[PDB]
Structure formats: structure tokens, C-alpha cells
Design a protein around this ligand. Sequence first.
Ligand SMILES: N#Cc1c(-c2ccc3ccn(Cc4ccncc4)c3c2)n[nH]c1N
Ligand SMILES: N#Cc1c(-c2ccc3ccn(Cc4ccncc4)c3c2)n[nH]c1N
Lengths: 215, 201
Amino acid sequence: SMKIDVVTIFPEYLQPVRQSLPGKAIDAGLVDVAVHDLRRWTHDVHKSVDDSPYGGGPGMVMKPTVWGDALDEICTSETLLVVPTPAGYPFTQETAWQWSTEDHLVIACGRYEGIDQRVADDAATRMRVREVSIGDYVLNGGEAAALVIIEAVLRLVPGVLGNASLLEGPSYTRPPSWRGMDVPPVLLSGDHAKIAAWRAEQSRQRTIERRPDLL
Amino acid sequence: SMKIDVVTIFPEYLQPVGLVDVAVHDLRRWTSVDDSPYGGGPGMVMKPTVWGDALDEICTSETLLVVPTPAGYPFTQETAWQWSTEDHLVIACGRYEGIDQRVADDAATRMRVREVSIGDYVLNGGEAAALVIIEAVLRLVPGVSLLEGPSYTRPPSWRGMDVPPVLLSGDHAKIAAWRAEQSRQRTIERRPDLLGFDSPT
Ligand SMILES: N#Cc1c(-c2ccc3ccn(Cc4ccncc4)c3c2)n[nH]c1N
Ligand SMILES: N#Cc1c(-c2ccc3ccn(Cc4ccncc4)c3c2)n[nH]c1N
């Protein structure tokens, strides 16, 4: 039973999440995802969410006063506050497993150069805060990271998304022959110990080739 | 100029997307897209037949075929730079347990193919990975290491928390030095692998 609140200046970006949520999971009260426009907490007629960086530099920084108000309203002491950032701890499958049993995730999506650091630092004095990165590339903001985190986490919550070391090897299905390429005959052999060993060797070879760091 | 075509059985999920155009294609337009795996196992595999027909129409010999997969080569900022100067990306999004391996194998006989993963976690399909890849690449298209430290803006005191005073001092050398120190500190703590040290636990 998980509530996820996402805060963003581009709420439309989170549309895929609401799309991928089965009615049965919502009706059973297994999951609730709500998306909030950060500008609801702006102070001025211009709905300002950013300002120039202290110490100079390029880009802009999201305002602490706006974010502070948003998180004050949405979070409680029990919230796990997730803050995507290219400077975060790595988000991994282990992370996803840990977070899948949380009652309440709040994902604070930044833009520009990110969020004034005092927002996360202040929040961390009264709730659990996690600054994380989904990989070693640079995005424009936290929304795509939120999509990835939400999917990785919710697919581990029994019955929410509709789904049920070494790298996975190649997979095959019908037809047995296609554009001159036959499915490896071992897979049609009915020798299931041999099939498992073949799959194990494929996994080994692929890991050596594509992810030697895993070895 | 760059053209990006995304192929998926869930075109609705790609909604978040002059020098670049992005087009989304429903795979079913070329048809049941899946069946049980040869050799056994849980779940289903996408059949190569429908994919072959779709890619035949969409791809040329100059196309870079991108195939998200948890078993891919890592997609990194270096990859994003490399792909930023491509004329044509086609992103083939799988579902279920993935796409019959012969799709990528057949495609590689006529174009360049890249199987990639955006990170070490499991998704239900390629669509979210496609959005990440598109965003990382498009921000580098012409005409568009170490972890970054913290950023601050006004007011200089908030909830009794001060912006680090060096950032208000106007001393560029000291500001550069402090920012380097925060950055070093953060990398050691959060990503020691970037500086060639063992990863935690
Ligand atoms: N997680 C994660 C990420 C992000 C990410 C996340 C949040 C924000 C907010 C703002 N930006 C843009 C930006 C900020 C600083 N430096 C450069 C660009 C973000 C990027 N990029 N790459 C990842 N793996
Ligand atoms: N890039 C990337 C990915 C994916 C991903 C990508 C494409 C597909 C198609 C199908 N699935 C689901 C699946 C398949 C096999 N094993 C487990 C789950 C996908 C996952 N997961 N994690 C990543 N970093």
C-alpha cells in the first residue's frame, strides 16, 4: 500500500505513470500516484521557481522558499523523500527493493542546475532523505528519473503494474526459422539440464563482453 | 539535424516528448506480438516477425538502431555524445521478457545496432529507457569525471541555514577551491568508483 507524490514544474511529464497503473491496483488501494505542480507554492505573481546561483556560474538554481513550502505540505516524518540529482548515490535494484515497502515516497524533481541544497538538508533533519542518480549521463531535470524510479519500484509491489551477478542471455520464440536464422537447436532438444548449461554459458559470455565490471 | 523514431506497443507512454523531430510508432500497426520462450522459462518473448516488418519500413542503412535492454552495454554520457551527431536514431522498445534476439541480429546485417542499458535496475519495458536516452542525447545535439557540488540561491539565510559564506565573498579563487573540495568530498562519499576506489559494501 504505497502513496507516491511527485513535485515538478512539468506535471504533464509524469503522465506515463498514471497511464501504466492498472485500475485493479488502484481500486484495491494498493497504490496512489499524485503529481503536483511546484508553481502552486510560488510566492509571486510571476510564479518564480528559480534564481541566480550564489558564487556565480551558469544556469539557475531552484528557490528554497518555494520548495520548502511544497515539502512542508506534502511530507510527514514518515516520508521517504527522494531527490534525483546527477550527483546522487546510485539508484540500483537493491534500492528499488528497499523502497518498494515504503508507505510514502515523495519525489522532488528539479530543473536547471538543481535545488538549493538547504531544502534537502532541512528536510533531512525531520525525515529520511535520499539523493540518488539513475545513471552516468546528464538529463535536463528529475522527471525522467522519477519515471524510472517509479517503474522500478512499483513493479516490485505485488500486483501494482500488472507484471510477474550475470546478464540475461538471448531469448527466442516462434517461428523456429526466420530470415535465415534458426533458433539454437539446443533450446528445442528437450534436454533441460543441457539447456540450462547453455543459457548459463551465454550469460557468462555476454557479461564478459558487455559488463566486465560485473566480474 | 536528427530524426528519432520510437517503436513500442505502448505509444501512450511516449507522450512526454526544428533541428530534431521525434516520431512514435505503434508496433501493432505491422501485425499477437509475443509467445512463450523456446527452451522454456517464465513470461513471454516478442516475436521477430512483427519487428522485422516495422524496422524494414522505418530503418535505412544509415540508421543507428537503439535497443534498450537490462542486458545491454552501459548507456553513459560518452554514448550520448557519440549519438548526438547521428542523423537517424530508431529506438526499439521491448516488453515482456524482451525481443527475440534475431531482430537485432538481422538488423545488424544492414545497419549499426546498439543494445544498451540505462542502469542497474529492472524496468517492465524499454519505454522509460527511451525517454532517458532521448533526453540525454537531444540536449547535446549541435545547436541546442567528478560529481557536482551543492548549489544555493537567495535568501542568504533561510530557516536559520546560511549559504556558505565563501559563496558571498566574491573571491573567485576561494569559491573555485571550495567548490572543488565539496565536489571531491561528494565523489568519495557517493561515487568512489569514479576516482578509482572500491564501491561500498
Ligand atoms: N537522477 C538523475 C540524473 C539527472 C538529473 C536529475 C535532477 C536534475 C535537476 C536538474 N538537472 C539538470 C542538471 C543539473 C546539474 N547539472 C547538469 C544538469 C537534473 C539532472 N541527470 N542525470 C541523471 N542520472
Ligand atoms: N535499458 C534498459 C532497462 C530495462 C528494460 C529495457 C527493455 C525491456 C523490454 C522488456 N523489459 C522487461 C524485462 C526484460 C528482461 N528481464 C527483466 C525485465 C525491459 C527492461 N530494464 N532495466 C534497464 N536499465
